[PDB]
Amino acid sequence: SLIVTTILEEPYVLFKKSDKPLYGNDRFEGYCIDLLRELSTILGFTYEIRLVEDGKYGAQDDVNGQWNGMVRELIDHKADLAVAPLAITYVREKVIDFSKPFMTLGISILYRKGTPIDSADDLAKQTKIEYGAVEDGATMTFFKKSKISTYDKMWAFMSSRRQSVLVKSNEEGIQRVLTSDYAFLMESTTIEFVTQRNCNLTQIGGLIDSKGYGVGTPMGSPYADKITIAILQLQEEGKLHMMKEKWWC
Amino acid sequence: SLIVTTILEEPYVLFKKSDKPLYGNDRFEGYCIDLLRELSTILGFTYEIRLVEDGKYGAQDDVNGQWNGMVRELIDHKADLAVAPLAITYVREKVIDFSKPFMTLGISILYRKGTPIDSADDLAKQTKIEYGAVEDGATMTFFKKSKISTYDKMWAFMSSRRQSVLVKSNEEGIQRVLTSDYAFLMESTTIEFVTQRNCNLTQIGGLIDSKGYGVGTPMGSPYADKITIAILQLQEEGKLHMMKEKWWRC
Ligand SMILES: N[C@@H](CCC(=O)O)C(=O)O
Ligand SMILES: N[C@@H](CCC(=O)O)C(=O)O
Numbered sequence A: 001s002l003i004v005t006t007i008l009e010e011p012y013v014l015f016k017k018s019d020k021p022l023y024g025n026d027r028f029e030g031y032c033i034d035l036l037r038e039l040s041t042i043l044g045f046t047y048e049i050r051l052v053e054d055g056k057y058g059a060q061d062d063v064n065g066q067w068n069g070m071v072r073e074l075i076d077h078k079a080d081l082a083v084a085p086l087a088i089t090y091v092r093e094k095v096i097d098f099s100k101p102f103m104t105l106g107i108s109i110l111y112r113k114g115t116p117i118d119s120a121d122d123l124a125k126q127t128k129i130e131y132g133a134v135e136d137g138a139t140m141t142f143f144k145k146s147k148i149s150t151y152d153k154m155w156a157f158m159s160s161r162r163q164s165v166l167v168k169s170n171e172e173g174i175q176r177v178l179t180s181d182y183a184f185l186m187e188s189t190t191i192e193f194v195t196q197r198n199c200n201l202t203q204i205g206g207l208i209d210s211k212g213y214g215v216g217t218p219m220g221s222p223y224a225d226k227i228t229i230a231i232l233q234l235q236e237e238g239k240l241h242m243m244k245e246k247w248w249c
Numbered sequence B: 001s002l003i004v005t006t007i008l009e010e011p012y013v014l015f016k017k018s019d020k021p022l023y024g025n026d027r028f029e030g031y032c033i034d035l036l037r038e039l040s041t042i043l044g045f046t047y048e049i050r051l052v053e054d055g056k057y058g059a060q061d062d063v064n065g066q067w068n069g070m071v072r073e074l075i076d077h078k079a080d081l082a083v084a085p086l087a088i089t090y091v092r093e094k095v096i097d098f099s100k101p102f103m104t105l106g107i108s109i110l111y112r113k114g115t116p117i118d119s120a121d122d123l124a125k126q127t128k129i130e131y132g133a134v135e136d137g138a139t140m141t142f143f144k145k146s147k148i149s150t151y152d153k154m155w156a157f158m159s160s161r162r163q164s165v166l167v168k169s170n171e172e173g174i175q176r177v178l179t180s181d182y183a184f185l186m187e188s189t190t191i192e193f194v195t196q197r198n199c200n201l202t203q204i205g206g207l208i209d210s211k212g213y214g215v216g217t218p219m220g221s222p223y224a225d226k227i228t229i230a231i232l233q234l235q236e237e238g239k240l241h242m243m244k245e246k247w248w249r250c
């Protein structure tokens, strides 16, 4: 029976609502939970879902080299799978393995409609409107490591105000955009969910990069390639598309 | 040195235009040739480019189990890599390995502008406008296997008209759209290149599926994971985007 680590994140993973108490895997629902169930049907495994304790996706500490979040769970073999909106990135791929992508996306900007802001460059050239990202995720790492002037500029701004502009979760960032003059750097798939529910909000500019979400496994795990094959079947049958429609003004 | 199989297909791989005759790797240019060059630098290998002899991408004969095209070259261990617009697919992943995607795309429709045709369903429910795809490619195979009624019906139409409506290459399909009442089922990245050069053509409807192009290797090859990591590096530093812009350019 596989241990599956995951993280709360609408509409990928949420606590299911019921008038009565819920237990075990039945406590969860969402795109990624449907995915996991489909994978289990194809590959024939049983599983137990566990929310990652530190509530983080996974990044490496620049001082002591320690990983955290779901990535660390995999490295340490505390979980067999990570099934979540987990970005496949160069630094992660060096320490854990990934199925091929079940969704493709990119970093973009969440802000309000009807403003003069039309791009990342517009944000970088000013300081009145604050902007930030989720702490310890792929988006933050992209800016921290970027050698592109605009993004390097944006990282200087964010890192000099880490405490005030970086947030612990997408939900926290979305709330900042809704209640203050703030633009949030986040993934395009998730922006699409937000903007279908918050009609005053919109994506600003296009995609800043491109990346996929993959199922994570410890490095060398035979499940990575098996899950790739199952994902390809699910995509080709139209199932992933139906799941997207179900979960996603 | 590695042997690299590939296929001619604008703007991924082209014969370089020249008055002088060119030899060896010098003969080729394109998005996929730049990709290959970048990978060679990162991974530190040299290589010989060879066009796949049978001119096919790769499909399995549903009677005798035999594969052809670039997939076959890899299976037979005749090539170390296939660097081309080669779709990562369920059936192929069972017989060869792939890097993670350097490009993401979907099946869509290439047709003329100004008509009421707005979706695959609109094509499926009539016969006056013929439609088809590249023979023995991932696009045709998607239709051949789909349980979706609309796509199953389109397959019945195409398979029963194999000789007239399935073509040997994107190029032939594009010419057919331009010269006759015909809609061509083809990959969206390639449609984008075409519609930027032909202002009377357009994509019809959205993407019908989603897939990626990856570098193919024999199953079990150490190069699959190594190339994944190199692709991730190229993406993250902005090079894949610059490469697309260069070759795609109303
Ligand atoms: N999905 C991201 C977290 C959210 C973000 O960074 O925008 C990751 O895998 O780290
Ligand atoms: N790129 C496709 C060929 C073109 C198509 O099928 O539309 C393949 O890998 O088979």
Ligand code: NA
Pocket: A092, A093, A094, A095, A096, A097, A098, A219
């Ligand atoms: Na890895």
Ligand code: NA
Pocket: B092, B093, B094, B095, B096, B097, B098, B219
């Ligand atoms: Na494989």
